[PDB]
Point group: D2
Chain length 392, copies 4
Amino acid sequence: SKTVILSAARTPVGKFGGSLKDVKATELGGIAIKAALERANVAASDVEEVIFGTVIQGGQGQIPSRQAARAAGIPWEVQTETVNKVCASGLRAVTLADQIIRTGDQSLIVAGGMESMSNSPYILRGARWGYRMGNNEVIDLNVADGLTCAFSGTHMGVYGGEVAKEDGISREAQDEWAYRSHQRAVSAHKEGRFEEEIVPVTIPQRKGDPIVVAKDEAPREDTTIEKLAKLKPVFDKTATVTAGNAPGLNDGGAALVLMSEDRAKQEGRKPLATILAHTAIAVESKDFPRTPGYAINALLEKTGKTIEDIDLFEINEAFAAVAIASTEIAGIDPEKLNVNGGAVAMGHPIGASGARIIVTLIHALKQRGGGIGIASICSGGGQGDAVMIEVH
Amino acid sequence: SKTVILSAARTPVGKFGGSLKDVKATELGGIAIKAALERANVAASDVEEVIFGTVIQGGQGQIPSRQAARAAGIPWEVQTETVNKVCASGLRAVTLADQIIRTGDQSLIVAGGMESMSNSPYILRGARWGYRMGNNEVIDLNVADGLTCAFSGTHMGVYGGEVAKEDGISREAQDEWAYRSHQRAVSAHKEGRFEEEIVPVTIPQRKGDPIVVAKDEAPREDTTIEKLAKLKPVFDKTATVTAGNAPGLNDGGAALVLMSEDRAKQEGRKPLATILAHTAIAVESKDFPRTPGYAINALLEKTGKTIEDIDLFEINEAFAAVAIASTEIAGIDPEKLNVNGGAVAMGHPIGASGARIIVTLIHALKQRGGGIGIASICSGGGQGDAVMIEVHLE
Amino acid sequence: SKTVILSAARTPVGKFGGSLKDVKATELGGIAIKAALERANVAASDVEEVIFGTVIQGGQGQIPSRQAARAAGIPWEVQTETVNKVCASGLRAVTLADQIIRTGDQSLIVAGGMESMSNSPYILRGARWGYRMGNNEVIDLNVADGLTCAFSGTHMGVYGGEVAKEDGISREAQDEWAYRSHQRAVSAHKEGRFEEEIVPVTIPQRKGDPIVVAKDEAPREDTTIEKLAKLKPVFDKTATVTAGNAPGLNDGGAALVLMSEDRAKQEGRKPLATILAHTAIAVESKDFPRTPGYAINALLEKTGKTIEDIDLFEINEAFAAVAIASTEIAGIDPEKLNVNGGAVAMGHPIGASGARIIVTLIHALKQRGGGIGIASICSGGGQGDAVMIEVH
Amino acid sequence: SKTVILSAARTPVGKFGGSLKDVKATELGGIAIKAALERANVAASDVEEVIFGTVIQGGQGQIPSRQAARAAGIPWEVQTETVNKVCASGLRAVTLADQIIRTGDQSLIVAGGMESMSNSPYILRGARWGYRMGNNEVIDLNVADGLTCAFSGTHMGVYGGEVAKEDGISREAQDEWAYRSHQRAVSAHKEGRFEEEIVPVTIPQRKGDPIVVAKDEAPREDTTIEKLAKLKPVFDKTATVTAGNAPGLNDGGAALVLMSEDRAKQEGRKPLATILAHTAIAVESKDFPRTPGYAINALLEKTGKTIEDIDLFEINEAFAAVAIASTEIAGIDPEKLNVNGGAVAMGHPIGASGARIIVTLIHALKQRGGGIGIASICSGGGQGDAVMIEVHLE
Ligand SMILES: CC(C)(COP(=O)(O)OP(=O)(O)OC[C@H]1O[C@@H](n2cnc3c(N)ncnc32)[C@H](O)[C@@H]1OP(=O)(O)O)[C@@H](O)C(=O)NCCC(=O)NCCS
Ligand SMILES: CC(C)(COP(=O)(O)OP(=O)(O)OC[C@H]1O[C@@H](n2cnc3c(N)ncnc32)[C@H](O)[C@@H]1OP(=O)(O)O)[C@@H](O)C(=O)NCCC(=O)NCCS
Ligand SMILES: CC(C)(COP(=O)(O)OP(=O)(O)OC[C@H]1O[C@@H](n2cnc3c(N)ncnc32)[C@H](O)[C@@H]1OP(=O)(O)O)[C@@H](O)C(=O)NCCC(=O)NCCS
Ligand SMILES: CC(C)(COP(=O)(O)OP(=O)(O)OC[C@H]1O[C@@H](n2cnc3c(N)ncnc32)[C@H](O)[C@@H]1OP(=O)(O)O)[C@@H](O)C(=O)NCCC(=O)NCCS
C-alpha cells in the first residue's frame, strides 16, 4: 500500500477550433498513454487497468477510456473504466488508481484524462418524442454538460466572478495573474522546461507532409497588462472575469503509469515520483472556485505537513481569481505556484486538466532538483481534489 | 476484512417511451439512493462518497452522480464521481466502492447506477464548424454511445447474433429462454417476490393525483413460444436475435449502501450481504457476449472456490443467447440462474443493470434462506465483470 | 376577356397532426386537381397551365405546383408555377389564372392551393457555416414562414388581438362568432351541404383497408359559449384571442378549372360560375386583419355594385374578430356571411384557404339557387384580396 | 400593345459562402429593385405590383417579395406575390408582369428575382412528431428544394451529364465552352461592359468602413482549358460534368421596371426595351436540360419569326453542355450567344438568374447598337421559358 509514478506525459494543449481540432479526444488520450508507457519502459500488454477521465462524453462513442487504451496499442485483454468528476476527472482517475493499487487488486494502472472541446457536438432535446410546434433550442454540449451548473443553469464563469467579488479580488489583480501565467508559460516553453513532459501530436494530412503539434497553442508572448485591462467582462457587465483572465475551451490528453512501490522495487525501477496522499472536499455548486485552498488545507491536516514543507504547487487556474483566492486561503508563496504557467495561459481541456497539472508538477519538481508538490483542482458542481507527490 | 451491503433498492424498470418516460435518470438514481439510505437506517449526511454509473451522459448535465446524490437529499459536502463501463457501470460503481472501503479511505459509500434511455437526446456532429453543403446525420445518442461499437459502428445485437450463431444456440433455445424469463419475472411480481427490493416512483401530474409506478413494465403475462417464434430477426435476416429474445431500451435506477465490517459492528448494524470478491476480464468488442461465463470462471479460480458452492447466479440477459452460452461455459444449473427473470423480460437500462442484478440477486438469496451468489454482466466494448456476495438471515 | 369556372373541388380540412397528417401537401393538391378535372369533364392533357398556391414551401421539394399537377395525372407537357401570397396564395392563383386567360395567352388553367402544416419541417440557421459555441434555436417553419411577421417577428395572433382591441370587439362577440361558425359547419355537414364540393382522401394503410377522410375534422358539434368563455388568451394574457375564436393550423387542398367564356361557349360547356372581377389592397403588416372589408369596398367601387347586390360572402375567418370587424367596415348582413361555416370552425390550411373559400362560396350560391358572391381574404404581411363570382 | 421595360438592374453575383455571404436574398432583391426605380426615374410609391422570384423560400420569412419591396423603399400600399418556377422564377416574374399589364389591370410593375444560396438553412424532417429511435438526416435545403428532382431525388447535375452523354457532347467541347464563358465575363468586366447594369452592394461592417461589392465574384481571369481538363466529374465518375463546366451555387438579385406603352407615352418615358412575346414548354424532369432550344423554336413559331432575325441570345448556362446542345437545336450562331459570359463563369443564383439574363441581354443589345434578343432558361422539374425583347437607341 504505496503507489509510485513511473512516467507522466501530456499532449500540447490546443485552442478551441485550433491546432488539435481534427484529433478526437480518445486519440489525444491514446498518444499520451503510449508516450507514458514508452517513458516507463512498460509493455502495453502488462497494463492491468486503464482509468481515464473525460467530461463531454456525448458523441465520443462507447466507453471512451477503451478507445484511448486501444489507440495507445494496449491490448483488448486490459480492463478499463471512464470516470467523470468534471474538471477533477483526470486527477480522480489517478487517485482512484492509487486506491486500487493500495488494495493489491492490481499493481500496474494507466490513469489520466482527455478532452476535445473542439469536437463536442450540439444536441436536440425534444426531437425524439417530437417538438409538435414552437421553436426549441439546439444546445452546445460543452455548455450543457461542462460549463453550466446542472442545478441553476448558471455559467461557471458567473460563479467565478461572484467569488472574486465576495473575496475582494480586483480586476487588476486578476489581469496581473493572467499576465504572469502567460509570461511563465512562454518562458517555460522558450527555455525547454516543457520539452520532457510533451509528446507531440502528428496529424496525417490531405497534403503530403504530416502536421506536428509540439507546443501549447494558447500562451501569448505579446499579451500585456494594458491589453488585458481593455477586455470586457464576459458573463456579467458588473463582474471582473474576462476572456483574458479566464482559461479557454481547449483540447488535450495526459497520462501517468502507476505501479505498487513493492513491484517497482522488485523490478529495479527508479520511480519518477511517489503518491504520498490525496483528499477531496465538496461544497455547494456556486462555491466551487473556493475549493482548491480548502483541499490543500485538508491534505496538509491529513499528512501533518505544513505549507512550508511543500516545494511547489499546481492549482488549476479555473479563473485567475482562483489562483489568487486559494493563495490567501492556504497562505502559499506565489513564487512556488504554477511556476511554468497555468490554465489561464495554457488552457483548460476539462477532462485532461487534472492529470495535466500532475504531469507539469512532476517536471517542475524534477527541474528544481526534486521535492514535495501538491496538485489541487476545483471542479464544476462544487468539489476540490488535491494530491501530494514526491520527486526524490 | 469484507465490505458489507446494508441495503439495496431499485426502481421499477420502465419501457422505452413508457411508464418512467417523464422521469430523468438522475431522479431515478435519487429515488433508489433515498430508499437505500432509509432501508439501511443510514443518515444521508453520514455518506462519505457516491459512486454512480450512467452510460448515455450526453445532455444529463454536469456530473450526473452529484445530481442523483442531491435528488436523494445527500448534502453538498459529500464527494461523488460518475463512472461509465457501458452495461457494467452500475456493477463497477459497487466494486469500486468495495476497493475504496478496503483501503480505509472511506467507511460508508452509496454505489449504483441509473439510465433513462427514453430521455437520451439526438446529436448533430458538424453543426459546430458548419456542414457547408450536403445532407448529414442526426444521431440517436443511445445508438452512438450505447448500442454501437466505437471501433466498427456495428450494433451490439449483430454481435449477439454472431456469437449465438458461432456457439450453435438455436432460435428455438433463445425463445424458450425468453419465455422462461417472462414467466419468472411475472411470477416474481404476482407472488410478491419483488415487493421488498422495488421502491415505487411517484410522478407528480400537472393534472390530478400523482402516478405511482410500482411494477416492472416490460414483463408480459401473455407472451408464448408461439408468438416469440413469429417475430422476425431485428439486425440480420439470417440471424436468430429478435425484439423478443433480446432486452429492450429501458429506464431505471438502483442503489446500494456499503460500509466497512468494523464500522457496521461499532454501530450495531446487521449486514444485508457481504462482498466476498470480484474480478473483470476483457476481450475484443465483437466477443462481449461471451464474457459472463469467463468472468465467473476467473472469479471462481481467484477465490479457490468451485461452481458447486454458488447457490444463485444473476447473468445479465444481454441476449437470451448469452444466458444459455454462459450456462455451458461456467457449467451452471439453469434452475439457479436469473430465478426471478432477467433483462429479456425485465429490460436493460444500461447504466443501472449492473447494480439492478445485484439488488435482485441479494433478494433472491434472502428468499432462498440465504447463500452465496454471483452477479456477472458483459458490457459493450468487450468486458465482463462478476461479484461474489454472501447473504445470511439472523 | 371573360373567365368561367367549370368546376371547384376541395379535400376535407384536417386538424394539425390529425386525419391528413400522413398526406403531403402536393398529394392533397393532386387529389383536388383530379376531382376538379373529372367534375369539369376536362382531359388532364388539355390543361394549358397549373397555378398553385402553397406558403410553407421549405422541404416540399422542387416547384410544388408541378408535384401536385403530376399527382393529379396532368402530363409533363403542361407548364406550372407555384405562387406565394401567404393566406391569399390559393385565391391569387385563381385571379392570376383569370388575368392570363383574359390576355388570350391560354384558355384552360387549373388554379388552387394546398398546405400541409402537419408536415412542415424544423430548420437550423447557423448549422451551414457553424454555430462555433453557445446555444441556438431550432425553428418551427410554420412559425418562421407562416405565423410571424417577417419585419417584427410578432405572431399574426398578436395583431389579430390588437385589432379586436382597437375596433372594440369584445371577447364575448368573438366567442359568439366562433360558436356560430362551429354550428353552421356541423349543420352544413349533417344536411349534406359539403357533399358536392368535397373529394374524399384515401390513405393507403399499413393495415389492409385504406382510410377514407370524407369530413372536415375541426368542426365541434359539442362546442358551446360556456366552454369558449373558459379558454385562456393564447398570444397575450390581456387580449381576447383564444384557441377557440382563432382558426387552427390545418391541412387541405382546393382546385378550380378556369376556361375562357368564348371557348366554353364554343365547346357547349355550362360553366359552374363566372369571374366578374377581383381586386387587392395592401396595408402595413400589423393591419392585415382589417383588409377584408377594405378589399370588399374596393371591389364594390371597382364593379359599381352596392353591398345589397351581393347574395353571399365568404370572408376567411383569420380570427372571429376579423369576420365581425369586416362585417362593420363593409356593412354586411351576417346572415349572408360564411353561411356553411368558416375557418374558426373548419381550419385555415394557409396556402389552400384562398381557393377553399371560393369552392365553398360557389356551392353555397348553387344551394340558394345562384346569385353573386364575393370571397375576401386577408393575408399575413398586410394584404387583402377579394373576387366577385356569379352562379347563374 | 407591347409592355415596355423602363430599367433593368442586377447585383454582382457572389460565390457560395463568398462576397455577399452576409446579405439576405430579400436585401439583394431590394438593392436591385431600388436601382431599377432610380434608373427608370419612377417614384417607389407609383409602383402598383411587385412580382419577385425566389426558389429556396424556406426560412426567408413571410412572402419574401414583400420584404424585397420594403427593402427597396416601396410603400406598404403596393401589392406583391412571390413566384417559384425553380431556375425560371426571375424570368416568369417578368412574363407574368407582361400578362398583367396587357390585361390593363395594372400599368406599372416591378418584376425580378433573388436568391442567397449561402444563407439557405438545413431542415429536420421527423423532429416535429419525433424520431422515436434510429439516426435520421439533416437536410441541406438547397439540395432538397433547389438541386434534386422532387420525383426521383436525382441531382440536376446527373441529368445534365445524362443529356450531355445522349447528345454526344464531349468533355472537351464542355470545357472549351466553360473557358469561353470565363473569358467573356472577365472581358466584359475589365472593358466596362457590366458597369451600367450592376448596382454595387454596400455591406455595413461592425468594424471600419462599409465593404462595396461591385464585381461578379465567380469569373476566373486565370482559368485555362488545361486546368479545366484536370477536374474530376462531380456527380458520376463516368460523366463529363465537373465543378468547372457546371455553374456554382450563388447569391444575387435582379429587377426590372415594366410599364404599359400608353402610360410610358403619357409620361414622356423612352423605353429601355419592349417585350415582344414569350412562351414556355414542359418536358419530363430528367429532360430539363434540353428545353432552352425547344423554348426558342416554339417562340419563333409563335411570332412567325426566323432564327436569323434575332441579333443576340442569352441561354442560361445550366451546364456548358446546355449552351452547346441548345445552339444545335435552335441553329444559333455561338458568336451571338451569352456574349458577355453566362452562368458557368458568372454563377446561378437560381431565383435571380431568369431576371439576371434579361438584364445582361438588354445591355448586350444596347452595346451592339440595339436589336432583337431572346433570353431562354431551363428549370429543374423540366420546363423552358423564353422571352423576346427589342432594344433601340434614341
Ligand atoms: C471566456 C470564454 C467565454 C471566452 O470564449 P471566446 O469568446 O471564444 O474566447 P476568445 O479567446 O476567442 O475571445 C476573447 C477575445 O479576447 C482576446 N484575448 C483573450 N485573451 C487575451 C489575452 N491574454 N491578451 C489579449 N487578448 C486576449 C482574444 O484575442 C479575443 O479577441 P478577438 O475576438 O479580437 O480575437 C470561454 O473561454 C470560457 O467560457 N472559458 C471558461 C471555461 C471554463 O469555465 N471551464 C471550466 C468549466 S467546469
Ligand atoms: C431489439 C430492439 C431493436 C427492439 O426495438 P423496438 O423495435 O423498439 O422493440 P419493441 O419493444 O417495439 O418490439 C417490436 C415488436 O416485437 C414485439 N415483441 C417484443 N417482445 C415480445 C414478446 N416477448 N412477445 C411478443 N411480442 C413481442 C412487440 O410487441 C412489438 O410489436 P409491435 O411493433 O406490433 O407493437 C431494441 O430493443 C434493442 O436494440 N435492444 C438491444 C439492447 C442492447 O443491446 N443493449 C446493450 C447494448 S451495450
Ligand atoms: C391558436 C393556436 C396557437 C392554437 O394551437 P394549439 O394550442 O395547438 O390549439 P389546440 O386546438 O390544440 O388547443 C386549444 C385548446 O382549447 C380547446 N379548444 C379549442 N377550440 C375549442 C372549441 N371551439 N371549443 C372547446 N374547446 C376548444 C382544445 O380542446 C385545446 O384544449 P386541450 O389541450 O385540452 O385539448 C394555433 O391554432 C394558431 O396559432 N392559430 C392561428 C393560425 C393563424 O394565425 N394562421 C394564419 C397565419 S398567416
Ligand atoms: C458542381 C457543384 C457540386 C460544385 O460544388 P463545390 O465542390 O462547392 O465547388 P467549388 O466551387 O468549391 O469547386 C470545386 C473545385 O473545382 C475548382 N474549379 C471550379 N471551377 C474551376 C475553374 N473554372 N477553373 C479551375 N478550377 C476550377 C475549384 O477551385 C475547387 O478547387 P478547390 O476545392 O481545390 O478550391 C455545385 O456547384 C453544383 O451542384 N452546381 C450545380 C448548380 C445547379 O445545378 N443549379 C440548378 C439546379 S435547378
